[PDB]
Structure formats: C-alpha cells, structure tokens
Design a protein around this ligand. Sequence first.
Ligand SMILES: C[C@@H](O)[C@@H](C(=O)O)[C@H]1CC(SCCNC=N)=C(C(=O)O)N1
Length: 264
Amino acid sequence: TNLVAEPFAKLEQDFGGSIGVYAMDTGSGATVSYRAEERFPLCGSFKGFLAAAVLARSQQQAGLLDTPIRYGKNALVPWSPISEKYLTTGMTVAELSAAAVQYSDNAAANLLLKELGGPAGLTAFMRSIGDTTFRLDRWELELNSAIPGDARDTSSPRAVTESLQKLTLGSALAAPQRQQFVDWLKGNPTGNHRIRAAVPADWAVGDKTGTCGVYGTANDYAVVWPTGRAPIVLAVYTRAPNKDDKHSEAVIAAAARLALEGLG
Ligand SMILES: C[C@@H](O)[C@@H](C(=O)O)[C@H]1CC(SCCNC=N)=C(C(=O)O)N1
C-alpha cells in the first residue's frame, strides 16, 4: 500500500489539502484506495443520488416521474438556471431530476428533496441500498458549508463508489430507470476537467460533480466504460483547511488518473 499511496500523498501536499479516492474494477474486483473511509462534504454530488432516489420511488409509484410540480418564486435559490425559467409554467419530477443532475440546479434539488420528505428522506433511501455512511442533514444552500470537523452532509469515497455501482450497474434500479440514470450521468457537461479529463476519449463516462465554494472542497464520482471490458466505478473528493483555500479541478483529474492506472 506504500507504493499505491505515495503519489496520492504527494498530490495532496502540493494541493495543500486532503484527497480521498476509491476505485473499483467491477469485473475483477480489484480496487485502489486512499483515505477511502474518511468523510468528505458531498456538496452538489448528492444530486446524482437524489435523482436515483426519485427513479427508485417511481418503481413503487407509477407515474411519479410525470407528476407536475408548480412552484412559486420562494422555491428559487441561488444557482437555479433551469428552474428559474419555468417559474411561469412548472416542471415535472423527471424534468427537475434532469436539471439537478446535469445543471446542478439548486431549486430543483430542494423541490425533489421536499417530495422525498426532506434531507432525511434521501438519507433513508441511501440506507435502503445498504449505504450506512452517507448522510444528508441540510438543504441547499446550507449543506455546502463544508466546515472542518463537521460530519453533516458528508460521505466517504468508498461508500460513494459502492452506492454508485449498485445504482448504475447492480439491481437497485429496474432497466428503464437504470438507463435513464446512466444517460443523465453520461450527458452531464459540468465535469469535463475532472474525472473525464483522465479517461481516453474513446471510453464513455458518466459523472456528477460537486463544488462547495469554500475550504477547497470539491469532488467528482463516475462510471467509466472501457471498450469491451468491465466498467470501472470511482470517486474523488477533496477538502482543505482554510476557508479561502481554492479547489482544483486539475488535482481531481490527476488523482483520478492515478487511481485508474493502478487498477490492473
Ligand atoms: C451550488 C454550488 O455549491 C455547486 C454544488 O452544488 O456543488 C453547484 C455549482 C457548480 S457548477 C459547475 C461549473 N463547472 C466549472 N468547471 C456545481 C458542480 O460542480 O456540479 N454545483
């Protein structure tokens, strides 16, 4: 593990913070781990799991995805580029889910959380798939505070990867819901400088990013489909000690590359 870990330790020292990584080869079972059981703030990365929770609920409530959500101005919070434009008409549950995943739309995220029973409702969904580490405690935007020591609104790289594998490749979602989730992740355009930058262009990637805006705290998780080979699932999370420390997309891409090259 010393030869596995040392390049990650070098990377986080030059970054000036902490990096957590977990990667799983779903064919062979091989893994790469660094700080994989430590907690890191989720920031907007929870929005991918939120869409999965909505899709899972649609397996018990036919027509949930078509349900219209007609909201007022008070539902709008900062960084709501899609939901801001449909204030005059409303949006359906599926349209809000797409916006939360692919634009990180905050109002859409809060509206979907409300449908699920709040942050506690998303945490309960994660428990239902066997994830005991994930916890969402607050709403947008308070969940982005990323204060050192605080376990609220955190998970671990290993738990993120394990849950992502269950939802995108395992049995948690039925085939139509599973392909919708995978398509939302694959079409996400916000992570071109993160895990995607470490992956050969020929290989499809689906990802969800998060960027708290403070404490150098940012992240990305992804499924990678190498051609003609079993997919890889991985998660890369960062944080830093000072409130004004800057996050780095380059550090996330570099850590992703170190993990992908070390699988085997
Ligand atoms: C709300 C804000 O803190 C942040 C988050 O939820 O984590 C929003 C803003 C951003 S927009 C990303 C812009 N990409 C720049 N390269 C993200 C994200 O990283 O997905 N989500």
